């Protein structure tokens, strides 16, 4: 979908890439990191950041690490890091939806040393989970068509101006991401 209707979405993604999406490496391997605001960034949990991670080849100290849980105490599989540099990240929290959102023409932004500035269109992003009695989804990962093979863990799922989730895995036919909501970063 290189077509005109994709204009604004692609723009937002290109922008987000530049200002906020960074290449990273931990003892665990190469990951795609998203900076949220100030010294805040998110990684996939299974990247298990140490006291020091590599950011675009500059080595940086990690002052605070905190795995995240939704309001129900479930594990979201996202680690939220606090970095030791003067540089501040453009705050993009304003593009994270009020509450977890599906999408119709989403694209996945991947940015690791081994796979730089890669945009992958993933089409429909869906919610796949259970229903707490009466309704409303508890236990929730988003998922989309993604026939590849584990990695690149870290991706950013974007639609039209919305930061929608963080890619945290796949199964060779589908990919799953931790749905994001503004609340998770209120501090």
TrEMBL record:
Compartments, as annotated in UniProt: Host cytoplasm; Virion
GO biological process annotation, one example: virion attachment to host cell
InterPro entries according to UniProt: PCV_3C_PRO, Peptidase_C3A/C3B_picornavir, Peptidase_S1_PA, Peptidase_S1_PA_chymotrypsin
UniProt domain Peptidase C3: residue ranges: 7-185
Gene3D superfamilies reported in the protein's UniProt record: Trypsin-like serine proteases (2.40.10.10)
GO molecular function terms attached to this record: cysteine-type endopeptidase activity; RNA binding
GO cellular component: host cell cytoplasm; T=pseudo3 icosahedral viral capsid
Domain of life of the native organism: Viruses
One Pfam family it belongs to: Peptidase_C3
Assigned keywords, A-Z: Capsid protein, Covalent protein-RNA linkage, Host cytoplasm, Host-virus interaction, Hydrolase, Magnesium, Phosphoprotein, Protease, RNA-binding, T=pseudo3 icosahedral capsid protein, Thiol protease, Viral attachment to host cell, Virion, Virus entry into host cell
Predominant place of localization: host cell
Family statement drawn from the similarity comment of this UniProt entry: Belongs to the picornaviruses polyprotein family.
Subunit-level organization: Interacts with RNA-directed RNA polymerase.
The name this protein goes by in its record: Genome polyprotein
């Amino acid at each position: 979908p290189r077509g005109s209707h994709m204009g604004p979405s692609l723009d937002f993604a290109l922008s987000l890439l530049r200002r906020n999406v960074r290449q990273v490496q931990t003892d665990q391997g190469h990951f795609t990191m998203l900076g949220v605001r100030d010294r805040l960034a998110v990684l996939p949990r299974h990247s298990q950041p140490g006291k020091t991670i590599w950011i675009e080849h500059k080595l940086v100290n990690v002052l605070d690490a905190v795995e995240l849980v939704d309001e129900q105490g479930v594990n979201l599989e996202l680690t939220l890091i606090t970095l030791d540099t003067n540089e501040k990240f453009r705050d993009i929290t304003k593009f994270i939806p009020e509450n977890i959102s599906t999408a119709s023409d989403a694209t996945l932004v991947i940015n690791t040393e081994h796979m730089p500035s890669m945009f992958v269109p993933v089409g429909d992003v869906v919610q796949y989970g259970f229903l707490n009695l009466s309704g409303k989804p508890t236990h929730r990962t988003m998922m989309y068509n993604f026939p590849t093979k584990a990695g690149q863990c870290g991706g950013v799922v974007t639609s039209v101006g919305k930061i929608i989730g963080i890619h945290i895995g796949g199964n060779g036919r589908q990919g799953f991401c931790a749905g994001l909501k503004r609340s998770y970063f209120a501090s």
